[PDB]
Structure formats: structure tokens, C-alpha cells
Design a protein around this ligand. Structure first.
Ligand SMILES: CCCCCCCCCCCCCCCCCC(=O)OC[C@H](COP(=O)([O-])OCC(O)COP(=O)([O-])OC[C@@H](COC(=O)CCCCCCCCCCCCCCCCC)OC(=O)CCCCCCCCCCCCCCCCC)OC(=O)CCCCCCCCCCCCCCCCC
Ligand SMILES: CCCCCCCCCCCCCCCCCC(=O)OC[C@H](COP(=O)(O)OCCN)OC(=O)CCCCCCCCCCCCCCCCC
Ligand SMILES: CCCCCCCCCCCC(=O)OC[C@H](COP(=O)(O)OCC[N+](C)(C)C)OC(=O)CCCCCCCCCCC
Ligand SMILES: CCCCCCCCCCCC(=O)OC[C@H](COP(=O)(O)OCC[N+](C)(C)C)OC(=O)CCCCCCCCCCC
Ligand SMILES: CCCCCCCCCCCC(=O)OC[C@H](COP(=O)(O)OCC[N+](C)(C)C)OC(=O)CCCCCCCCCCC
Ligand code: SF4
Ligand code: SF4
Lengths: 121, 63, 239, 233, 181, 123, 61, 190, 68
């Protein structure tokens, strides 16, 4: 399937370039479930990154599942308007897709030198 | 072709008394035949230059 | 209701204190709670990307992440894309040379999340010839900055469309903001009458530059000073 | 801090100017705001979407032209702007006309600042307390041995700054302007760097000015406010 | 409404007089507009080189700093009380995850605790191994927030916006600029 | 700055020496084709083969450079100089920086031996 | 102590004008159009009356 | 409550949602009333009448060689080396004006003279690299060099614009009556 | 102000010979009160009159045809 994350033409909104997004919450909860599924499948359960984004998107998805109207969920979420929120959930989905390729839970590959990181005491 | 009409309306304006009631209708018909070619021109937007500064109409469909 | 009958301001009772009272307080004391919050945030950021973050430093509500050059692009994307961070706007990026280090230049990136009202710094390193990768694929506004950091410093940004000089002369040989380059430089300009063009010549002054840095203090002018580290983030003494 | 004290009778004068400036700026607003020529010449020119205004590094009146409510003197306040009450104008369409309308109202808000600071001005010292970072008064240094020593040292050598690094950003009327200074610990800065606000604006010119006509490449220069002491230095 | 229109006799401007004032109340757009010129006896009299206030002027100061005898300067200097850059390696964060903290030390047997510190100080354990060995309560207490959520990017003084809508706005309805307070 | 300048190249660093040799080969071809354009463009006095032999000589300067990384910075600087020269951004007074000795004989009394250098103590 | 400085008045200054002073001036637009049609139509009255008078003069000559 | 993460109390304000723009049919103006303003150019005539009002008011121009503009005593122009009462050169060669000058305009050589008093042999200012910051006047403890409010000294050669000790002693001679007026009003504020 | 009555009444007060001299000197017609004279010889005047803008009150009448 395919999902819409940002209207680039439609009913105007306070931000320029964003417009009003029809049916924000099904797109929102589907984008959440994609983040949950890919993040559970491809990251190790020890890692702190996986733990907090699983908890974070579980918290946001709980808020979106509970309340029925738009203006109250966007107060409980804490981010901007829900068009902007759908852009953010999209963005963290793409981030969680990139992190499985980059694999950052490994120990660091390039250790610094001792002469590196000195600043005049 | 608009200039040539404006100089074609110049013989009439000097003889407007002589051709009473008759050359009036002929000049009406002449001007109306011109006006429909003019509304062709304004419906085609021939003299307007568009802008290729499109605001990215197409939205963000994903996956 | 006239402009001659308007009252004057200059004769009226003006406020008069015999004595003003201003309490004295360290301006570093107002930061301390937010500086502790900034500590906890940065410890989380290091625990999230352990492969890519070598260190951090918190000065006084100023956070700096300390990252390798091959680790530039994976950290920056995180700072853009994670919802907790959202450092959308690039502010200013530049370089500083320490000639005493083996990797001469360090490259600093400043970001601002206008959502969370937060700033962040990202410091990497680069030698004169080895590069640091460019974040201009992420940010449309970064490239001019990167390119400015080119011409003054000679730091390279691999993967950069339109890397060349900016805000120096076109035929300029050298990189100005660099400790081996002298102040007045190498060349000068005059109008040769013969050739009927300006000519670029080796440098010569009618008054020599006199620096007065020779003659600074011989007493160590400031102390070590205190610390803003909270009691949670320093190592416990045993027993 | 400040160089020296105000002259003796300036505070009664900045009021007398403000009372008439409130009308002198209504009048400039008349033949531009509702001119159909000035409107048509500036309606969809220079349109900046709110997500592109951040990637380009744009700030001040150009970021607040495009919808996003951010200014440093409210968000991260400094220099007693918290104590002074004002409002902020922020446009909705990213055009040159909402970048115009928010400039026209920051005049209003600035005149409000001037009035609220003329009324609430306190007494006291105008420079910092101590004579190890700025000079004593000439009454004192001709009498005081300590203050003559401090006067003679703050000008030959200067004061010394603790070793460190800072980026301090405030809001110029052009937009966010900051400075990144690296302090050696000596009395000369190891490194300074201004972030010119107009540098990022002129660097964002060809992102916006594609597809516009040639007259509309000039009214867009006037909104990004290029003074060029900023952009190159 | 507090800053609204005031008439032009409270504006310190040369204005008009006589029958020519009655003429210009007719021929005007708004009658309460000044003409721009300052009043000559009011604006800048006496000139700045001849002021009676310059004879009486004396250097200002505040009381706990101009005090002749109670303060010493070392109590009230803050240039020399500057704080330092808290530079943290990767290995000192492993120390903070495994040794503990000074607020909550997880260290017993201090004479053996120094030796327990020393291998981390030499690079015994790794940071990923420190995160894996760490308990769920430690990870949710000090790395994460206590609910299990990532810490929000901190700001010093949060700003809560309030849009002014009615007649207190700077532009009325129909103009594309809003005031945000 | 979405789109780039006309004769631009995204700067890219090659880990093999033979790819760098191919790129400097292509770059000499690009300078050498554009020398009639430079002679027309900067209104110079002399002939096109002097520009071409200047281009050859400036590559003759850096032939025996060993370090690939230094060859890489040297290539990037040379392509930037090409992009400035071909787009007509450099002017004729900075184009003729490259020819300081051709335009005029500086004068008599060129010091070659120790004695002529000594009589003016190196000037 | 701080003597000889400039200080605000003890009562404060009067409030300045910082609101927009743009009052809507003019008649209604229908008044201007009705006046326009009246001025025009009286002009057409005098003009076409003069044309007919000039025609009678041409008859006489 | 507790906020999510990516989430502060910076929620959107009450009323950050726009209202939908009005169509043509939901407007209070008639088509005839609106288009009378269109074809009879209403606000154009209003802005025309503004500058017609400005035709009938007083201009601001002053006539320059006959009427000068504003002066505060703090104002800075050309340079002057003052003298004591009963004529002594005031410059004790302390080099403080040289050490502070941000554009390196000052150059001084100093020698002990026949009296054993410390005086300048050579004092000099380049006025082509002076930037008029007034630090040289703020720095002098004797108050030997000042800035006279003369700006009308524009020259035709550069050689004339290089001021040695003699040109500046002649200035501090010439302007001394005026520098009295300046430092009677400035010296408490310094 | 820029009225004709002001230039007319100042031309009447100053007198026709000094009017012609001030007209060859400046464009304005000014009536002052002789505050003092210069050591170089330059008479200075200050204006009482009500319709005077700010920075118009004081002026010089020079001596030479070539003035500085
Ligand atoms: C037509 C002009 C109508 C102007 C209306 C009156 C405006 C006015 O003066 O109010 C001043 C008033 C302020 O007065 P004030 O500064 O307080 O006091 C100054 C005194 O008035 C004291 O100043 P004053 O009023 O005494 O002015 C001096 C005036 C004497 O006093 C008058 O003002 C005259 C009385 C007013 C009736 C207008 C007759 C003058 C017509 C000008 C032609 C002169 C011939 O002397 C002269 O008349 C100078 C004429 C000298 C001859 C010039 C050389 C030959 C010119 C040949 C003309 C033909 C080609 C053009 O300003 C306003 O009220 C706002 C003006 C609103 C304008 C609305 C539009 C007006 C109608 C459109 C005019 C189009 C042009
Ligand atoms: C195209 C532009 C044409 C040139 C400009 C035309 C100007 C319009 C002329 C209109 C004449 C006029 O002055 O309007 C009449 C005015 C008010 O008109 P109104 O309130 O609409 O009621 C009219 C009922 N007889 O009635 C009055 O103002 C009379 C005022 C009497 C009291 C004065 C005090
Ligand atoms: C020298 C001869 C010049 C003639 C002017 C040019 C042609 C006429 C143009 C029509 C504009 C007009 O006069 O409209 C009249 C209106 C004032 O009416 P109102 O206050 O808005 O009340 C209307 C309330 N209703 C709608 C309920 C009825 O505008 C003005 O006066 C603004 C000043 C323009 C002055 C022009 C000079 C004429 C003197 C008028 C003094 C009242
Ligand atoms: C040389 C002599 C001086 C000439 C200078 C020109 C005078 C301008 C006066 C301002 C008039 C104005 O601005 O009227 C403005 C009106 C609009 O009013 P509204 O905003 O809809 O009011 C709404 C609120 N009410 C109703 C409650 C008040 O326009 C019109 O409907 C038609 C505009 C026609 C103007 C024609 C003027 C002719 C002048 C040419 C001679
Ligand atoms: C679409 C257009 C519709 C017009 C409807 C108006 C009807 C008004 C009735 C008045 C007639 C009248 O009584 O005036 C008659 C007048 C004067 O003639 P006279 O010399 O006095 O007559 C004497 C007869 N002899 C000569 C035989 C002795 O003549 C006219 O031509 C003026 C007509 C009014 C002008 C209308 C113009 C309308 C605006 C058009 C904008 C392009
Ligand atoms: S003029 Fe002043 S600062 Fe300069 S040498 Fe003389 S006394 Fe010193
Ligand atoms: S005014 Fe400034 S630049 Fe000029 S001599 Fe004095 S200190 Fe130097």
C-alpha cells in the first residue's frame, strides 16, 4: 500500500507549504505501526535506541488511539499541528530504516588520539 | 491588425452625418466582426507569459 | 488644544533616589539546573549512538558532541530526524586550526531546533588534505557555509557540488584564516601605467605592522575556577 | 556594559520624538500597504515554504514571513527584554508581502519598547562593577593608585578572558546574528567568527528566485536586506 | 486601546495656528497628525554643551560594591569563579554506568572500589558491554526518563505563545499578518 | 543552491592512482580545448600556443608528486582554476597573473653570479 | 549614590500612539458612481444639445 | 500530564489553526461597490492625496555653510594636542594612545629633553587610517590629545593629511577656546 | 515655513540693500539680531521668529565673496 504524509496543495494552514491533510489519524496510526514493526524486526532488543523509540511511538500511538478529535490529540501530543506530526512520524520511520543499514549499537570504530581534544586547560 | 482597424474607423468618423442610420449599422457590424477576433485573442491568453515557478503541486505519497 | 499651550516635559518632578541597591550574584548560578538537564540529555545521546559519538562537553547551557569525520553524516541525520532532537536549521559551520595537533583543523557545526528551542554543536576534525564529508545533501543552506569554510581554511567537503572559493580574490593563492598565512599577506595591487592594467606585486609596506602581543602578561591571569558538574555525573569516590 | 552615561536631558527628548513618529510612520504606510501597484509587484514573489526556510538557515523576518513563530528576544531572552512587554508580527504566506507587513509592525512594537523603557528607567551604575575588565572614571583614576594601575593596564594589555568557546546569537533586525568566539585565555581572541544573517539569505537566493521574471529578481533583494557588510567581511 | 489615537496637541510639533487650523481640519485624512517639525523652545533647549546638570554629576554605584569596608573583592569577583568545560570521554560514561554516581553510589568496599575503578580507567570494559550489563532500572533511571521515554531537547526558559485575535491585534481581519504575543 | 554552475564537478576523491591519472588526463584535454576561448575572452596580445605551453608547463611543475592525497588536492585546485577561467569570472588582470615574465622585460642588471647579487645585496 | 543623572518623571510620561491610525475616509462607492453618472449624463445633455444647434446653424449657412 | 518525547509544553497555541479563506459569494461588499473601487482607483487617490498634503508643509533643509547641524560635545573630528595653562605641551609620552589605537594610526618617538622632563620628540597621526573611535582621547591620563568637533578640513593631497607634532599643536592652540566648551560638559561623564 | 509672506516681511525688516546682499549670499531671507562678530570678521545672527523650523535659528553672514 501507500500513504500520504504531507499535502502540498489544498486548504491553507498557518505554515507555508503545508496544507490541510485529509484523514490524518489513519495515516498516522499506520505510519506508527510501520515504525513499530520494522524497528522490532531489525534492531537488537538490548540497544537503548530501539527501547526508547518503541516506548515513544507506543506512547504517541496510545494518544492517537484514545481521543476522537484533532484539536485535543494535538494538545496531548506536544508537537505542532497534526500535518506536521505526520511529517515527523514519517521522518522517524525513515530514520529507523536507515539505522539498520548503519548499525550504530556497535562499539566505535575510530578512536581519537590523546593530542586530539585539548583546549588550553 | 488592430492599428489597421483604428485607421479604418477614421473614414467613418468624418462622414458620420451623411450615412445617417445606415453607415451606423455597417460600422457596428465591422466593429463586432473585429471584437470576436479580439475575444479569440483574450481567450487564448496569447500575450501572457507563464511562470515556471511551480510550487511542487504533487504531494508526498510514500512506499 | 494648541501647540503653544502644550506643557513642557523638562520642568516636572523627576524621580530621585538617594542610593541604589543591586544585589551581587554569580551569573553562572542561573544556568545550573538547565546545565544538569543538558548533561542527562547528552548522556542519552551518547548511549543512543555509541558507534559514532566519541565524547561530549557541556560548558554552560552549551552542548557539544564530539564526533569522527567518517561519522559526520550518520550523526547529523539523527539530529535532523529523531523527534526528540529535530535540529532542522543549520546555523553556522566553520573551522578552527590548532597547528599543534596532528589533525590541524577542527570543523564545528551549529544547529537549532526551533521546535524545542534548543541549540547543539557538533565538532569533528580534518587535516589540511584529508576531507570531512559534506552535509549539503541533508541541508540546502549548508553548502555556502561549507564553501566559506573552504576558502579561509582549505578544509574539504567530499560530495559537494560547487566547491570553489568565495569572498576572496579569484587568482588568490593561499588560505587566509590560517596561522601560517601572514596578516598583510603575500601580494599587493597597483595600477601599472605601462601595461595599462593593475599588476599584482610582492608585498611592501610604507609602515611595518607592529604587533603588541609581545608584551602580554607574565602572571597567569585567571585561575582554574569552579565546576558546574552535577553530583550525578561525576565518578563516585570509593567508600 | 556601556561606554558612558546618557547626556543630561535625552530621556525627555526620546519621548518628544516618539509622540510624532507614531504618526510619521502611519503616513509611509498609506501609499504602500494599499497601493495596487505595490501590492501586485509583491504578492507571490519570493515565496518560502516553512520547511524550506529551516533547511536554508533563514531567520528573523524571513522565517517569520513563512508562518513559524520564532524570535530570540522572546524565545531565549536577554538584556532585559523579559521585563518589557511587546507582541510579535509573524506572516502566513511566505511571500515578500508578508515579509513586508511584519516589518511595518516591528516599528510599532519597537516604539512600544521605547515608551516602556523611557517610563521604567532606573538609576545606578552604567558600566560593570569592577575595574579589572573596564576602566575607572577619570575622577577616580587621578586620585586612586589602584585605579591608575587598572587604567594603565586595561589599555596597554587589556583584560584577559577565561579559556573557552561560545556561540552567542541575538536577533538583529536583519535576522538572527551570532558570533562564535574561541578564547585562548590570552587577551587577544584566538578566533572570532560572525554569522552574518544576510549570508544565509543571499545564499538562499537561487532556491527562491528560479522561475521568476527579471523585475521580480530585485524586489526579492530588498526583502532579504542585503547590506553586504554582513555577507562578505 | 491604550496606545490608540491621541489628538495633535499632545505631540510636540509645530502644527498650525488660527484660521489655518480650521482649514486643515477640513482638508485632511486624519486630523490628529503632526507635521514632523519639532518645537523650537522645547526640543533641545538648553544645548548639550550648556547644562546645569553637568556641574552636579557624580559617578554612580550600587551599595554592596561601592562599600568602603565590608566587602573584599574576592567574595564578589566572578571572572575568576568561571566554571570549566565538563569534558566527558566514552570511558568516563562507562564509569558512571558501572561505578555509579556521587548522588547514588553503587560502590562498596572502597579500598577494593579503587581497584574496581582502575580497570575501567585503563579500559577494561567497553561501553556497549556497559550498556548490556546494566540493569533495566539503571537504564530507565539515568539514561532514559523514569517513564521510559527519551529525554526532550532541553530549553532554558520555555515560551508559551498566545495569539491575539480581536481588536487588540496589530492588523485587522483580512490582512495576512497575525500578532503572536 | 539546488542546481550547480555550468562547468562544475562534485568533488570526489579517488583511492586509486590510475583513476586520478585518467582525470588529470581529461582535465588537460579540457584546458587545451579552451585556450582559443581564453585568448578571445581576455583580449591578450600574444598567440594561442603560448597559453597552451603555459598549460603544459604548469602540469610539468607537478609531475613527480608521489602522495595520492596531495595529487587529489592538486587536482581539485586545478579544476577550480579551470572553472574560474572558462566561465569568465576571472578578469584579464588576474588571468595575466599567470604570465608575469612575458609581458615586459623588468630591466637591466639581472644578478646571476655572487658579485652582481652582492653589489645590490640581493635587492 | 547617584546624583545628576537623567531619570523619568515621578508620574511617568503620557501614553504615545502606536496603533495604526488609518480611518476609512470617503463617501460610499455607490455615491461616487451615482455622482459620476450624474456628471456624465448632464455633460451628454449639453453636448448633444450643442450638436443639434450646430446642425441648425449648418442648415442656415 | 507527561509529555511524549519530542514534546514539550510548547504545543500549538489556542487558535493556531487558520480559518479557510472566504469565497467570492461570502463577502459583505456588493459587486458594484467593490468594482467602483476597482475602476475608480480609490486607494490610489488616497495615497495621491497624502503627498498632495505634503506639498503644503515646511521643508527640513538647512543651508550648510550658513547653518550647521547638530553638535553634542562628545562629537569627534580632527585631532588636537592641548597645552597647560601657562603653555606646556601636556604630552608626557606615555604611549597609551599608541597602544590602544585600533587602526595603528599613532606613531610616537619620545626622548628625555634638556629639563629632564619626559616629552615627545615626534608625535604623529595618519588621518587616512584613523577611524575616529576616540580611544586615544579616552586613554590619555593627562588628557593631552582630544578630538575637536571640526570636520571641515578636507584636503587635496595625502601629504597634507599626515599630521605631525606641529600641526596638532597648532590645532590644540586654535581650538582651545572651543575645547573648553566641550570638556566643561563632557568631563563629568568621562 | 516656505510662504511668500515670510520672505516678504523679512525683506521689509532687513532692508533692500542687505536683502540684495543676502540674496547673492543665500537663497533665504533672514532677519536676526546681531549676537556678535568674529575676529576674522563674520557677523552672526539668531532668529526670534515663530515660524522657524528646528536648526534654522542661528546663521552666519560672511565677509568675503569666497566663503568657507
Ligand atoms: C490651488 C492651491 C489651493 C491651496 C489651498 C490652500 C492650502 C494652504 O495654504 O493651507 C495651508 C495649510 C497650513 O497652513 P500653515 O502652515 O499652518 O500656515 C501658513 C500660512 O498659511 C501662511 O502662509 P500663506 O497661506 O500666507 O501662503 C502665502 C501665499 C498667500 O496666502 C495664500 O495661501 C493664498 C490664499 C489661498 C488661496 C489660494 C490662492 C493661491 C493660488 C496659487 C497661485 C498663486 C498665483 O502667497 C502666495 O500666494 C504665493 C504666490 C506667489 C506667486 C507664485 C509665482 C507665480 C505662480 C503662478 C501660478 C500659476 C501657475 C501655477 O496646510 C493645509 O491646510 C493642508 C493643505 C491641503 C491641500 C488640499 C488640496 C488643495 C487643493 C488642490 C491644490 C492643487 C495645487
Ligand atoms: C468620479 C468622481 C466624481 C467627482 C467626485 C464626486 C464627489 C461625490 C459628490 C456627492 C455629493 C455629496 O456631497 O454627497 C452628499 C452628501 C452625503 O451624501 P449621502 O449621505 O449619501 O446622502 C445623500 C442624500 N441626498 O451630503 C452632504 O454631505 C451635505 C452636508 C451638509 C452639512 C455639511 C456640514
Ligand atoms: C479644490 C477642489 C478639489 C475637489 C476635490 C477633487 C474632486 C472630489 C473628490 C471626492 C473626494 C471627497 O471629497 O470625498 C469627501 C470625503 C469626506 O467625506 P467623509 O468624511 O468620509 O464622510 C462620508 C460618510 N458617509 C459615507 C456616510 C456619507 O473625503 C475627503 O474630504 C478627504 C479629503 C479630500 C479633500 C479634497 C478637497 C475637497 C474638499 C472636501 C472637504 C470635505
Ligand atoms: C487637485 C485636487 C485634489 C484631488 C486629490 C484627489 C482626492 C482624493 C480624496 C480621497 C477620496 C477617497 O479616498 O474615497 C474613498 C472611496 C472608498 O471609501 P471606503 O473605503 O469604501 O469607505 C467605507 C467606509 N464608509 C463608507 C463608512 C466611509 O473611494 C470610492 O469609493 C471611489 C473612488 C473615486 C475617487 C475619485 C476622486 C476624484 C479625484 C479627481 C479630481
Ligand atoms: C444608453 C443611453 C440611454 C439614455 C437614456 C437617458 C434618457 C433621459 C431623458 C432626457 C432626454 C432629454 O429630455 O434631453 C434632450 C436633450 C436636449 O435636446 P434639446 O435641444 O433640448 O431638444 C429640442 C428639440 N429640437 C432640437 C428639435 C428643438 O438631448 C439629448 O440628447 C440629451 C439626453 C440626455 C443624455 C443621456 C445620455 C445617457 C448616458 C449615456 C452614456 C454613454
Ligand atoms: S597624548 Fe596622552 S596617551 Fe598619547 S603619549 Fe601623550 S599623554 Fe600618552
Ligand atoms: S581616534 Fe581611534 S584610531 Fe584615531 S588616533 Fe584615536 S584611538 Fe587611534
Amino acid at each position: 500500500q501507500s500513504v500520504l504524509v504531507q499535502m502540498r496543495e489544498g486548504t491553507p494552514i498557518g505554515l507555508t507549504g503545508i496544507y490541510q491533510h485529509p484523514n490524518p489519524r489513519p495515516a498516522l496510526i499506520a505510519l506508527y505501526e510501520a515504525t513499530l514493526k520494522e524497528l522490532q524486526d531489525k534492531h537488537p532488543k538490548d540497544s537503548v535506541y530501539r527501547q526508547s523509540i518503541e516506548n515513544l511511538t507506543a506512547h504517541r500511538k496510545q494518544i492517537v488511539e484514545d481521543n476522537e478529535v484533532s484539536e485535543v490529540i494535538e494538545n496531548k501530543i506536544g508537537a505542532g499541528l497534526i500535518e506536521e506530526v505526520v511529517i515527523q512520524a514519517h521522518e522517524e520511520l525513515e530514520l529507523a530504516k536507515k539505522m539498520s543499514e548503519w548499525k550504530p549499537w556497535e562499539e566505535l570504530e575510530e578512536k581519537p588520539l590523546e593530542d586530539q581534544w585539548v583546549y588550553f586547560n | 491588425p488592430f492599428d489597421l482597424e483604428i485607421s479604418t474607423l477614421l473614414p467613418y468618423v468624418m462622414s458620420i452625418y451623411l450615412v445617417s442610420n445606415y453607415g451606423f449599422t455597417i460600422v457596428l457590424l465591422f466593429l463586432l466582426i473585429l471584437i470576436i477576433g479580439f475575444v479569440y485573442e483574450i481567450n487564448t491568453n496569447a500575450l501572457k507569459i507563464n511562470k515556471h515557478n511551480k510550487p511542487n503541486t504533487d504531494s508526498l505519497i510514500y512506499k | 488644544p494648541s501647540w503653544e499651550n502644550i506643557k513642557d516635559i523638562r520642568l516636572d518632578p523627576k524621580v530621585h533616589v538617594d542610593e541604589v541597591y543591586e544585589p551581587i550574584v554569580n551569573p553562572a548560578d542561573r544556568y545550573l539546573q538547565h546545565v544538569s538537564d543538558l548533561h542527562q540529555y547528552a548522556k542519552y545521546i551518547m548511549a543512543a549512538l555509541p558507534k559514532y559519538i566519541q565524547g561530549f562537553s557541556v560548558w554552560k547551557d552549551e552542548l557539544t558532541l564530539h564526533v569522527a569525520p567518517s561519522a559526520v553524516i550518520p550523526v547529523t541525520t539523527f539530529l535532523r530526524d529523531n523527534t526528540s532532537t529535530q535540529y532542522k536549521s543549520i546555523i553556522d559551520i566553520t573551522a578552527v586550526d590548532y597547528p599543534s595537533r596532528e589533525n590541524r583543523f577542527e570543523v564545528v557545526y551549529n544547529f537549532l531546533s526551533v521546535r524545542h528551542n534548543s541549540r547543539i554543536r557538533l565538532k569533528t576534525y580534518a587535516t589540511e588534505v584529508t576531507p570531512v564529508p559534506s552535509i549539503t545533501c541533508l541541508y540546502e543552506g549548508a553548502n555556502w557555509f561549507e564553501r566559506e569554510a573552504y576558502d579561509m581554511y582549505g578544509v574539504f567537503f567530499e560530495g559537494h557540488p560547487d566547491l570553489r572559493r568565495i569572498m576572496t580574490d579569484y587568482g588568490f593563492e593561499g588560505h587566509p584564516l590560517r596561522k601560517d598565512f601572514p596578516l598583510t599577506g603575500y601580494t599587493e595591487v597597483r595600477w601599472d601605467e605601462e601595461k595599462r592594467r593593475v599588476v599584482y606585486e610582492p608585498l611592501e609596506l610604507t609602515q611595518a605592522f607592529r604587533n603588541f602581543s609581545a608584551g602580554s602578561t607574565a602572571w597567569e591571569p585567571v585561575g582554574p575556577g569552579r565546576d558546574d558538574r552535577p553530583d550525578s555525573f561525576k565518578l563516585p569516590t570509593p567508600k | 556594559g556601556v561606554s558612558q552615561d546618557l547626556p543630561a536631558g535625552l530621556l525627555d527628548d526620546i519621548y518628544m520624538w516618539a509622540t510624532q513618529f507614531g504618526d510619521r510612520l502611519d503616513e509611509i504606510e498609506e501609499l504602500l500597504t494599499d497601493n495596487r501597484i505595490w501590492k501586485l509587484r509583491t504578492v507571490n514573489i519570493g515565496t518560502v515554504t516553512a520547511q524550506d526556510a529551516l533547511n536554508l538557515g533563514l531567520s528573523g523576518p524571513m522565517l517569520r514571513g513563512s508562518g513559524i513563530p520564532f524570535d530570540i528576544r522572546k524565545n531565549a531572552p536577554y538584556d532585559a527584554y523579559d521585563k518589557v512587554d511587546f507582541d510579535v508580527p509573524v506572516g502566513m504566506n511566505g511571500d515578500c508581502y508578508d515579509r513586508y507587513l511584519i516589518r511595518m509592525a516591528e516599528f510599532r512594537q519597537s516604539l512600544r519598547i521605547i515608551e516602556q523603557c523611557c517610563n521604567d528607567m532606573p538609576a545606578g551604575a552604567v558600566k560593570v562593577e569592577d575595574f579589572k575588565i573596564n576602566s575607572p572614571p577619570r575622577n577616580l583614576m587621578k586620585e586612586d593608585m589602584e585605579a591608575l594601575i587598572h587604567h594603565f593596564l586595561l589599555y596597554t594589555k587589556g583584560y584577559s578572558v577565561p579559556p573557552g568557546e561560545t556561540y552567542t546569537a541575538i536577533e538583529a533586525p536583519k535576522g538572527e546574528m551570532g558570533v562564535y568566539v574561541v578564547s585562548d585565555g590570552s587577551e587577544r581572541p584566538y578566533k572570532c567568527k560572525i554569522r552574518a544573517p544576510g549570508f544565509a539569505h543571499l545564499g538562499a537566493f537561487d532556491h527562491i528566485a528560479r522561475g521568476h521574471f527579471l523585475p521580480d529578481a530585485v524586489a526579492i533583494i530588498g526583502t532579504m536586506d542585503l547590506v553586504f557588510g554582513e555577507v562578505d567581511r | 486601546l491604550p496606545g490608540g489615537p491621541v489628538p495633535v496637541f499632545k505631540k510636540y510639533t509645530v502644527g498650525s495656528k488660527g484660521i489655518w487650523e480650521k482649514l486643515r481640519v477640513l482638508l485632511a485624512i486624519a486630523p490628529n497628525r503632526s507635521t514632523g517639525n519639532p518645537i523650537v523652545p522645547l526640543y533641545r533647549v538648553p544645548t548639550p554643551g550648556s547644562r546645569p546638570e553637568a556641574n552636579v554629576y557624580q559617578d554612580p554605584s550600587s551599595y554592596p560594591t561601592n562599600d568602603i569596608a565590608e566587602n573584599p573583592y574576592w567574595k564578589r569577583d566572578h571572572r575568576r569563579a568561571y566554571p570549566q568545560t565538563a569534558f566527558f570521554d566514552q570511558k568516563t560514561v562507562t564509569g558512571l554506568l558501572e561505578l555509579g554516581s556521587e548522588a547514588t553510589p553503587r560502590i562498596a568496599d572502597g579500598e577494593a572500589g579503587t581497584k574496581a575503578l582502575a580497570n575501567i580507567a585503563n579500559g577494561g570494559v567497553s561501553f556497549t558491554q556497559a550498556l548490556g550489563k546494566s540493569s533495566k532500572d539503571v537504564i530507565y533511571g539515568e539514561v532514559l526518563t523514569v517513564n521510559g521515554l527519551p529525554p526532550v531537547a532541553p530549553t532554558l526558559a520555555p515560551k508559551q505563545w498566545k495569539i491575539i485575535e480581536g481588536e487588540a491585534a496589530i492588523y485587522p481581519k483580512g490582512y495576512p499578518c497575525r500578532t503572536f504575543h | 543552491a539546488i542546481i550547480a554552475t555550468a562547468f562544475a564537478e562534485t568533488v570526489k576523491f579517488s583511492g586509486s592512482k590510475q583513476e586520478l591519472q585518467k582525470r588529470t588526463l581529461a582535465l588537460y584535454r579540457q584546458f587545451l580545448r579552451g585556450a582559443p576561448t581564453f585568448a578571445d575572452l581576455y583580449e591578450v596580445q600574444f598567440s594561442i600556443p603560448t597559453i597552451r605551453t603555459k598549460i603544459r608547463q604548469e602540469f610539468e611543475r607537478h609531475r613527480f608528486v608521489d602522495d595520492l592525497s596531495i595529487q587529489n588536492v592538486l587536482y581539485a585546485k586545478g579544476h577550480m582554476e579551470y572553472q574560474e577561467c572558462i566561465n569568465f569570472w576571472k578578469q584579464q588582470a588576474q588571468f595575466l597573473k599567470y604570465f608575469p615574465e612575458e609581458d615586459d622585460i623588468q630591466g637591466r642588471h639581472q644578478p646571476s653570479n655572487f658579485v652582481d647579487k652582492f653589489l645590490k645585496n640581493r635587492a | 549614590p547617584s546624583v545628576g543623572q537623567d531619570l523619568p518623571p515621578v508620574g511617568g510620561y503620557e501614553p504615545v500612539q502606536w496603533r495604526r491610525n488609518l480611518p476609512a475616509r470617503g463617501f460610499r462607492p455607490l455615491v461616487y458612481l451615482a455622482a459620476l453618472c450624474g456628471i456624465c449624463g448632464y455633460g451628454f445633455y449639453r453636448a448633444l444639445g450643442g450638436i443639434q444647434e450646430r446642425r441648425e446653424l449648418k442648415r442656415e449657412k | 500530564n507527561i509529555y511524549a518525547g519530542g514534546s514539550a509544553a510548547a504545543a500549538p497555541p489556542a487558535g493556531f489553526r487558520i480559518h479557510r479563506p472566504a469565497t467570492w459569494e461570502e463577502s459583505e461588499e456588493g459587486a458594484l461597490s467593490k468594482a467602483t473601487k476597482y475602476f475608480l482607483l480609490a486607494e490610489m487617490f488616497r495615497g495621491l492625496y497624502v503627498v498632495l498634503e505634503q506639498f503644503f508643509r515646511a521643508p527640513y533643509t538647512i543651508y550648510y555653510p550658513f547653518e550647521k547641524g547638530p553638535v553634542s560635545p562628545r562629537f569627534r573630528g580632527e585631532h588636537a594636542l592641548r597645552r597647560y595653562p601657562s603653555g606646556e605641551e601636556r604630552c608626557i609620552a606615555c604611549k597609551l594612545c599608541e597602544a590602544i589605537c585600533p587602526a595603528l594610526a599613532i606613531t610616537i618617538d619620545a626622548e628625555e629633553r634638556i629639563d629632564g622632563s619626559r616629552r615627545t620628540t615626534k608625535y604623529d597621526i595618519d588621518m587616512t587610517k584613523c577611524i575616529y573611535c576616540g580611544y586615544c582621547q579616552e586613554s590619555c591620563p593627562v588628557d593631552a590629545i582630544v578630538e575637536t568637533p571640526n570636520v571641515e578640513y578636507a584636503t587635496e593631497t595625502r601629504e597634507e593629511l599626515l599630521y605631525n607634532k606641529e600641526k596638532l599643536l597648532a590645532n590644540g592652540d586654535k581650538w582651545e577656546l572651543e575645547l573648553q566648551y566641550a570638556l566643561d560638559a563632557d568631563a563629568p561623564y568621562r | 515655513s516656505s510662504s511668500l509672506y515670510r520672505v516678504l516681511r523679512n525683506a521689509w525688516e532687513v532692508g533692500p540693500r542687505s536683502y540684495w546682499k543676502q540674496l547673492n549670499s543665500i537663497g533665504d531671507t533672514k532677519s536676526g539680531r546681531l549676537v556678535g562678530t568674529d575676529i576674522y570678521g563674520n557677523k552672526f545672527y539668531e532668529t526670534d521668529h515663530q515660524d522657524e523650523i528646528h536648526l534654522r535659528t542661528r546663521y552666519v553672514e560672511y565677509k568675503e565673496k569666497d566663503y568657507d
